Subunit: 21 residues, 2 copies
């Protein structure tokens, strides 16, 4: 999670964290 | 878009699609 290459975010199966694209 | 290995979904940067984990 640093820049916003896309509007819609996306989460992942780790510990509860998402990001852009 | 077939199996849900995780509750929180994630939208990829393509054309407006998401998935689980």
């Amino acid at each position: 999670g640093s820049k916003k290459p896309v509007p819609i975010i996306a989460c992942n199966r780790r510990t509860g964290k998402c990001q852009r694209a």
